[PDB]
Amino acid sequence: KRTKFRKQFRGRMTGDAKGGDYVAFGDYGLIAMEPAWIKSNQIEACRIVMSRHFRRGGKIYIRIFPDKPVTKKPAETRMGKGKGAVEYWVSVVKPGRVMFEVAGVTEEQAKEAFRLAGHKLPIQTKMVKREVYDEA
Amino acid sequence: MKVRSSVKKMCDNCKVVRRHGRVLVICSNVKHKQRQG
Amino acid sequence: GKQPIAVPSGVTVNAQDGVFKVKGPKGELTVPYNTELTVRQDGDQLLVERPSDAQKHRALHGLTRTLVANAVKGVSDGYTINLELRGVGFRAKLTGKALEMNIGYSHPVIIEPPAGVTFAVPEPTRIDVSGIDKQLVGQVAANVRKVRKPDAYHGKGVRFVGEQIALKAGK
Amino acid sequence: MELTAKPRTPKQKLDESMIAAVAYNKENNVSFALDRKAFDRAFRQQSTTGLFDITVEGGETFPALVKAVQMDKRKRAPIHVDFYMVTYGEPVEVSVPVHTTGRSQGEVQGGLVDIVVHNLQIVAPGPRRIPQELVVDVTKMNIGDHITAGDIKLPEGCTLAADPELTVVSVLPPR
Amino acid sequence: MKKVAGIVKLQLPAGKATPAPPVGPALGQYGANIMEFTKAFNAQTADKGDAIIPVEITIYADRSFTFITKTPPMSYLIRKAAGIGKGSSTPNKAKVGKLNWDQVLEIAKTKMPDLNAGSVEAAANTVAGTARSMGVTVEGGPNA
Amino acid sequence: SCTTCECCCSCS
RNA sequence: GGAUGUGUCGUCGCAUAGACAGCCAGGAGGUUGGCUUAGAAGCAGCCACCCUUCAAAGAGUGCGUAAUAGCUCACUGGUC
RNA sequence: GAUGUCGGCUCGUCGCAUCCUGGGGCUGAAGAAGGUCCCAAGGGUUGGGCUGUUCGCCCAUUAAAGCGGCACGCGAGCUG
Ligand SMILES: *Cc1cccc2[nH]c(C(*)=O)c(C)c12
Ligand SMILES: [Mg+2]
Ligand SMILES: [Zn+2]
């Protein structure tokens, strides 16, 4: 969720993914098709969404942790400097990027743990299966 | 009649019709009578 | 797609132009259709072939035949639907031809048959709408089935005999 | 894989459904460019354990083995593949995936079994006879049975490349 | 009480009277007497007391009715055989116990009026399906 | 009605 | 986000030895499957999802009741 | 080298994300009375106590006593 410790701040930019494999830790995987910023709680909403659907298994992997601190509007003004030290934490996903990938539950019992976790994500995504053999 | 923007089936009867430029939902059940417009 | 066409003796088709004129024992009728919608009587029976096939063309096809078949069953035997009056005090008499409604309304409901239709009331709680054109009979019959649609609790009003209508059940 | 052309310019193919590869070994490193759908419907099956017919335009059937393939992100489709020509008695090293069979003794028990490592690699496969699969027992496993390479039976000869006690699968408990 | 006929099917205990819980308003509001049933029924259940023998009732009209005794439950005989008086939430995980095939001889010799199976082997492997999901294992069998 | 096992029920 | 609105390419698929949709008819016996509860019988929730016959019919679609029941389905045959 | 600022009073007018009238679907809609959503701005939308107020509370009614916009409409119109 929120990182244990770091520097404090950042800035911004974008360009197609880089560290987004595919198959790994599961046969099934939900993928990101759009350049976004993923709020920490937006993962919770997903993970939990998923738990519920899976009574047991825990074969769900979230390799899209929040490594970025953002700020906010201190009610108004502008006559000051850095603000909102603690607004929220994001995890900058990028196309072809892989956020989730269940395992163990049949197709349709995965083809939902995803549909659902999808509805609450800032971006569109498509599920993927196998034939991902680059490195291992 | 339920006017929703996200129209979709509800059981094994829902016959998603398309009358005068409109996407609808006719089901034996009426609680299922959906309509985008 | 549709092709079979049983054009028994009595009838008489005249595909003279877009005007597919008909004549029978019940009464000469007339049903228009599309032109590019090829159709003619081959030997004895009949057939409504079509130029292109897919949708735009296959739709009208599914149309033409059906409609011609009606013109057939039309003048040949004619149409007549059967309605039933249901509920306490529901009834329908007659005024010359005019179906006389009386089903719970402070004042009765008088209905008038269109030029080419006639009502029939066997018992005072059963309706009969006989007529020529298949549409009309239906087009007209529906209006009655409107005067008082069956309530979702006792299925009153007008209905189609074996009218399958379940009661919501209240208190 | 009647892959014909083979130049540095892929214009006559990028647009028309055709993949783009390159085979070699240490002798001929002929530049290539095969068909999309083909390799598509092809690499699928045999995967990285299947040498197929490579009669480049003109008639010159060559034996090869699928090495490293780089598909496009954002889109599940591939773009570049690496064929490593067969050899005779020794190709190099292969990647053999892991499987499982028969109901495990931990699944109905109270949990599910998990393959810690999907595809597994071993040392010295053996040209002409390189496993295109790898079935491994699982039943015996209960609530914490960690199967390592030191177990999986080898197809007469084949030697293991990955470390011995490395877990390949483990029946993960419930919740 | 009222002029009503039709059908009826239930499952009351064997060697136990029929108070308000068993019948009473249940099959009483169909025009029938519980009294004459508290007897006749528990009359045939004596040969097989200490269980709950399923029995269907047929109504006609007025104050007429019938009944057909069946075979009592066999989960009671096994519980006693395993020293357990309650079922199991997990029939695969936490099972009950273990019996012998000799106990199946008397299963297809009393439950034969219902068992429409082929001949012996058929109903013999039919009953196991009921035992296999309950929590009881099969002893012996083919080979060995 | 009204139960399966204590004492009341149903019936019309 | 939604959708039998078209055009063009791709995948399964399943099939005149006669499918799909329509129709008539059937529909299993064990078993109110075992389990939890004031109870819950193909359908609130744990566990499985086996046997028998058969041309067949799955401890099971959904609706329904306080459980029943009742109503259809997957599997089966003839009509085209 | 001035675009007068709150509230009210007078005068309107327009938008709809409709307060009431009018039409309709579903309802857990028995009737009656309601809930909700859909269509619909023709017309209507009370009088007092407190407070500069805007609002809001309170009296007594009502079909209702809508929410906003037009330099928080309107001071070369007034009050102040
Ligand atoms: C005990 C109990 C609980 C719920 C409903 C019930 N109906 C009756 C009827 O007699 C009883 C006693 C109960
Ligand atoms: Mg966007
Ligand atoms: Zn529906």
Domains of chain D: 1-86 (2.40.240.10), 87-175 (2.170.120.20)
Domain limits for position A124: 18-136
Enumerate residues with CB within 5 Å of ligand 3 (an ion): B 10-11, 14, 27, 32
Amino acid at A57: G
E19 CA distance to ligand 1 middle (Å): 15
Half-sphere exposure (CA, 13 Å, Cβ side) for D13?
A: 20
Q: Is D101 helix (H, G, I), strand (E, B) or coil?
A: strand
Task: Output phi, psi for C102, to 5 deg.
Answer: -170, 85
Q: Is E113 helix (H, G, I), strand (E, B) or coil?
A: coil
Determine the CATH number of domain C1-78.
3.90.930.12
Amino acid at A94: K
Contact C137, C129 (CB under 8 A): yes
Q: How far apart are CA C157 and CA C137, in angstroms?
A: 19
Amino acid at E93: K
> Looking at the domain covering C79-171, what would its CATH class be?
alpha beta
Q: What is the dihedral of CA C84, C85, C91, C95, to 10 degrees?
A: -40
CATH number, residue E66 = 3.30.1550.10
C54-79 b/e with 16+ CB inside 10 Å = b? Answer: eeeeeebbeebbebbbebbebbbebb
Statement to judge: residues E45 and E106 lie in one domain: no
A5 within domain boundaries: no
The helix or strand, by DSSP H or E, that contains position D146, with its residue range, turns out to be strand D146-148
Q: Of C131, C112, C5, which Cα lies nearest the Cα of C67?
A: C5
Cβ atoms within 10 Å, residue E63? 11
Nearest CA of chain A to the CA of D58: how many Å?
A: 32
A9 within domain boundaries: no
Q: Are strands C126-131 and D112-114 parallel, antiparallel or unpaired?
A: unpaired
Give ∠ CA A68-A74-A79 in degrees, rounded to 5.
Answer: 105
Contact D58, D80 (CB under 8 A): no
Q: What share of chain A is helix, strand, coil (3-state, %, to 5)?
A: 15, 15, 70
Amino acid at D116: V
Instruction: Kindly report the three-state secondary structure assignment for every residue of D42-73.
Output: HHCCCHHHCCCECCCCCCCCCEEEECCCEECC
The answer to whether B5 CB is within 7 Å of strand H is no
Tokens, residue A94: 């990028």
Domain count, chain A: 1
Cβ atoms within 10 Å, residue E89? 7
A12 within domain boundaries: no
> What is the arrangement of strands in the sheet containing B24-25, beginning at the earlier edge strand?
B2-3, B34-35, B24-25
Radius of gyration over alpha carbons of chain B, in Å? Answer: 9
Q: Are strands C126-131 and C79-86 parallel, antiparallel or unpaired?
A: antiparallel
Tokens, residue A14: 């974008």
Tokens, residue D79: 């773009």
DSSP at C8: -
Domain boundary among E55, E70, E85: E70
Contact C108, C100 (CB under 8 A): yes
| Ligand sitting nearest the alpha carbon of A35 | 2
Q: Exposure of D165 by Cβ count < 10 A (0-12 exposed, 13-18 middle, 19+ buried)?
A: exposed
- C1-78 and C79-171: identical CATH topology: yes
Query: Can you say which residues of B are annotated as belonging to the binding site for Zn(2+)?
Result: 11, 14, 27, 32
Chain D, 140 to 159: residues with Cβ < 8 Å from chain A are none
Q: Is the CB of F2 under 6 A from ligand 1?
A: yes
DSSP string across A46-107: HHHHHHHH-SS-----------EEE----SS--SSSS--TTSEEE----TTEEEE---SS-S
Contacts of A73 (CB under 8 A, 6+ apart): A83, A84
Chain D contact set for A128 (CB, 8 A):
76
Q: For strand H, which nucleotides have at least one atom less than 7 Å from a protein CB?
A: 24-30, 37-38
Contact D169, D115 (CB under 8 A): yes
What are the distances in angstroms from CA E97 to CA D22, E108, F12?
65, 21, 45
The helix or strand, by DSSP H or E, that contains position C84, with its residue range, turns out to be strand C79-86
Q: What is the dihedral of CA C126, C129, C134, C138, to 10 degrees?
A: -60
Q: How far apart are CA A33 and CA A27, in angstroms?
A: 19
Domain limits for position E45: 1-70
Domain count, chain E: 2
Domain chopping of chain C, boundaries: 1-78, 79-171
Amino acid at C30: T
Q: How was this structure determined?
A: X-ray
Q: Is E30 helix (H, G, I), strand (E, B) or coil?
A: coil
Q: How far apart are CA C15 and CA A119, in angstroms?
A: 59
Residue the block writes with tokens 């934490």: A89
Q: Is the CB of F11 under 6 A from ligand 1?
A: no
Query: Resolution to 1 decimal, in Å?
Result: 3.7
Statement to judge: residues E130 and E86 lie in one domain: yes
A127: nearest CA in chain D?
Answer: D76
* Long-range pairs, A132-136, Cβ under 8 A, ≥24: A132/A21, A132/A22, A132/A23, A132/A24, A133/A23, A133/D47, A133/D48, A133/D69, A133/D95, A133/D119, A134/A21, A134/D68, A134/D69, A134/D70, A136/A24, A136/D95, A136/D117, A136/D118, A136/D119, A136/D121
Residue the block writes with tokens 């045939």: E44
Q: What is the dihedral of CA D105, D109, D114, D120, to 10 degrees?
A: 0
Tokens, residue E8: 């009826």
The residue whose C-alpha atom lies closest to atom 4 belonging to ligand 1 is F3
A54 within domain boundaries: yes
Q: Is the CB of F3 under 6 A from ligand 1?
A: yes
For residue A30, what are the β-bridge partners? A100, A127
Chain A partners (3+ C-beta pairs within 8 A): D
- For the CA of E6 and the C1' of G70, the distance in angstroms is 13
Query: Which ligand 1 atom is at minimum distance from the Cα of F2?
Result: 7
The helix or strand, by DSSP H or E, that contains position C127, with its residue range, turns out to be strand C126-131
Nearest CA of chain A to the CA of D157: how many Å?
A: 23
Half-sphere exposure (CA, 13 Å, Cβ side) for A10?
A: 19
A3 within domain boundaries: no
Q: Is D41 helix (H, G, I), strand (E, B) or coil?
A: helix
Statement to judge: residues E47 and E77 lie in one domain: no
E8-27 b/e with 16+ CB inside 10 Å = b? Answer: beeebbbebebeebbbbebb
In window 21-60 of E, residues with CB < 7 A from nucleic chain G are 26, 54
What are the distances in angstroms from CA D38 to CA C38, D31, D86?
46, 18, 20
Contact B28, B13 (CB under 8 A): yes
Q: How far apart are CA D97 and CA D95, in angstroms?
A: 6
Contact D144, D173 (CB under 8 A): yes
Domain boundary among E10, E41, E70: E70
Q: Exposure of A110 by Cβ count < 10 A (0-12 exposed, 13-18 middle, 19+ buried)?
A: buried
The end-to-end CA distance of chain D, in Å, is 47
For residue B24, what are the β-bridge partners? B35
Tokens, residue B10: 């509800």
The helix or strand, by DSSP H or E, that contains position C101, with its residue range, turns out to be strand C100-102
- For the CA of C155 and the C1' of H29, the distance in angstroms is 15
A1 within domain boundaries: no
Tokens, residue C114: 């269109």
Q: How far apart are CA D113 and CA A57, in angstroms?
A: 10
Contacts of C1 (CB under 8 A, 6+ apart): C53, C58, C61, C62
The helix or strand, by DSSP H or E, that contains position C140, with its residue range, turns out to be helix C134-147
CATH number, residue A106 = 3.90.1170.10
Contacts of D110 (CB under 8 A, 6+ apart): D143, D173, D174, E93
Nearest CA of chain E to the CA of D24: how many Å?
A: 56
Contact C68, C5 (CB under 8 A): yes
Q: How far apart are CA E32 and CA E18, in angstroms?
A: 14
